Design a protein around this ligand. Structure first.
Ligand SMILES: CC(C)(COP(=O)(O)OP(=O)(O)OC[C@H]1O[C@@H](n2cnc3c(N)ncnc32)[C@H](O)[C@@H]1OP(=O)(O)O)[C@@H](O)C(=O)NCCC(=O)NCCS
Ligand SMILES: CC(C)(COP(=O)(O)OP(=O)(O)OC[C@H]1O[C@@H](n2cnc3c(N)ncnc32)[C@H](O)[C@@H]1OP(=O)(O)O)[C@@H](O)C(=O)NCCC(=O)NCCS
Lengths: 364, 368
């Protein structure tokens, strides 16, 4: 198989995939998009790994086929952090997603949506799908892997599980494993979607009713863990939305901001994928079956750049400090100044650009 | 005549009809009250204890008839305790709009059926007016001090600011001058989680056999997270599984099982309707409303106060207490409590919170 036309969308059939749990999901497709020109040696691939609700559209404007622009708009191109004049930015839709790759909303063999029959996946299963997707194109080793959040967890299992198939990695706003705080809010986000009457045990697809209310609830609660406490108060405080009265049907500024944030997600994301991908986040743990977190990291030789956000409330700075101390390929923690919490790795263009540019230098 | 209830008993004080800040009127308001210790000769030793969102008048004592769970500050009032009952009379009420004794959404109105969707939104200032009206109904017009945390701290704040001449001192724990954006964000969403429950029935579920249990449990699980510290949880539960359950095969995580138990535990002692009404009184908390702003209102309050905050508080960060301490002239300086239990530290650190209460009562003595 060949890479899709630069910019366009493409599907890569990797066949059956045996998961860490033993389950076997067959006829697996992996959507992918590429910016940049593949090298004659196929050795300049920079794999960009997206987060929970992201997809393969990492950069570019909106329009046909893409409701919203890329989540890292401007990270790939001439002179950009990932210089496409000499690098090949390859992004894929994670396994279990809903933007082209096999997931709960995809159809199985019986001609009906996977739904509740979709097997539970892990971060290592998402990585095996990406690695297999690249193999289907003749790419065994990639120059670097970069991602934040789930994308960071995907980049951590890539450098630890396949150290010889990658030359460098950028771990952004992620930890070596899921924390109690992350699982607590994420398992409750799931319970919010599952308590919606229209969830229908996960087989709501093609029935007309979906768990919209539950999905908005989960997204609103999650968005709070993405932002910084001070940034929210400084920006919204307790002000009212316009001239509304929260005492008699109005809304607060922050309340109107969260409802919009959940509305943006309903029009593009599927609840089933939100559950499956969140359950994969909960299972994140680089030390499982490797002798613990410390052993797995001490035994990883891949050179990596670790970045952490100060005001991050979902992935506190202490987690990245642990990663940098234990990974021998990492000099030290690379703090990203930002007041926007976890969203810092999405908004701090210049700060994140420096970490990417440092990561590609190690790949050289 | 309306009298205080016996120590350990519950009393139902009638205050008649009250007019809320919004203009609405609440008829036949009933406020539940509990006492600890005798009144002094001049009746000048009343220490009002104001509970938090899901609290009640059972501030101390074991479980027994009418009190399934011990007091939220077990050991805070009594002989030699922080509120030494040999000197002070600990008076605690159930907040207006509560489900735990006083008039609220679950209480029956005049037409015979519950208030429900007919209960008007109340502000923190409305809850203070009711408590002051309750004490007045008995005959108390001046208290020695007010103490509370969270919503209890908000009630205490509006008390010293609104009735400076009828209170000698106050203790403000883990609270801010006004509701923050992060607080209003999660709290409005919690309200939305209860109303999205198909059994909410616009709030008129009380006499239908159905209740929004799913929504309330969800709102509580999210709220409990904001009450704890990040490091506390990871050290306690990490990513461990619950018992022998396996998340890979539909099992639960340790922290997941813990949060579920918190929802159920509140689910069997609290009313969803009250949760919504009280949660929205928190949203409207703004000591500066109608007073020229936060700084003006606090600058004008001369009551001596003790302000304390928790280091790991994630819902009411330390910066909020620091602001209160800086704007209130009656405060000598922020008192920092070192705890790992986040916002819940004001309930757990009974030794560090005990001293702040003793400092507050010391100011009440000096001012008397
Ligand atoms: C884009 C993002 C990542 C960071 O960008 P940002 O600079 O912080 O932008 P903001 O969200 O603060 O504000 C922009 C939007 O909020 C809207 N908004 C702001 N205040 C509002 C209000 N009071 N009422 C309604 N909408 C409001 C703006 O209109 C704008 O809407 P738009 O999407 O149509 O352009 C973040 O905003 C987002 O959308 N999601 C973050 C969560 C996420 O992606 N998580 C997965 C990665 S781990
Ligand atoms: C009272 C309170 C502060 C207790 O805090 P704590 O003393 O530090 O102890 P915890 O509640 O965190 O843990 C003990 C309880 O959790 C349970 N628990 C612990 N681990 C568990 C697990 N893995 N799975 C299930 N349940 C678990 C224990 O069995 C115990 O149950 P119990 O409530 O019947 O006693 C608080 O947790 C509570 O129950 N209510 C507080 C109400 C409130 O609004 N607080 C904030 C002020 S508004």
């Amino acid at each position: 198989q060949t890479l899709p036309a630069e910019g366009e969308i493409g599907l890569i059939d990797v066949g059956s995939l045996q998961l860490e749990s033993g389950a076997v999901i067959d006829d697996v497709c992996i959507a992918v998009q590429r910016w940049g020109k593949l090298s004659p040696a196929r050795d300049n691939v920079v794999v960009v790994l997206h987060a929970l609700t992201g997809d393969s559209h990492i950069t570019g404007p909106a329009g046909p086929g893409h409701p919203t622009p890329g989540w890292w708009d401007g990270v790939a191109g001439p002179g950009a952090p990932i210089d496409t004049t000499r690098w090949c930015a390859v992004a894929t839709n994670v396994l279990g997603g809903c933007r082209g790759s096999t997931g709960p909303s995809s159809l199985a063999r019986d001609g009906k949506p996977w739904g509740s029959r979709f097997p539970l996946i892990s971060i290592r299963d998402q990585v095996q799908a990406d690695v297999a997707a690249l193999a289907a194109l003749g790419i065994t080793e990639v120059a670097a892997v970069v991602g934040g959040s789930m994308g960071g967890a995907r980049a951590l299992e890539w450098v630890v599980g396949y150290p010889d198939r990658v030359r460098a990695g950028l771990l952004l706003a992620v930890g070596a494993r899921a924390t109690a705080d992350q699982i607590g809010t994420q398992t409750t986000q799931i319970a919010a979607i599952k308590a919606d009457p229209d969830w229908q045990s996960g087989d709501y697809h093609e029935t007309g009713r979906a768990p919209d209310a539950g999905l908005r609830l989960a997204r609103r609660f999650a968005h709070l863990t993405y932002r910084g406490e001070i940034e929210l108060d400084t920006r919204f405080a307790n002000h009212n939305q316009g001239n509304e009265d929260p005492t008699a049907g109005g809304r607060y500024a922050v309340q109107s901001y969260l409802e919009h944030q959940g509305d943006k997600l309903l029009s593009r994301f599927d609840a089933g994928s939100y559950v499956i991908l969140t359950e994969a986040l909960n299972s994140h743990d680089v030390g499982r079956g490797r002798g613990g977190v410390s052993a797995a990291l001490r035994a990883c030789p891949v050179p990596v750049v670790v970045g952490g956000i100060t005001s991050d409330r979902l992935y506190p700075l202490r987690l990245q400090q642990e990663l940098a101390d234990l990974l021998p390929g990492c000099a030290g923690l690379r703090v990203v100044e930002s007041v926007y919490g976890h969203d810092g790795f999405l908004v701090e263009t210049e700060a994140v650009g420096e970490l990417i540019r440092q990561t590609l230098g190690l790949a050289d």
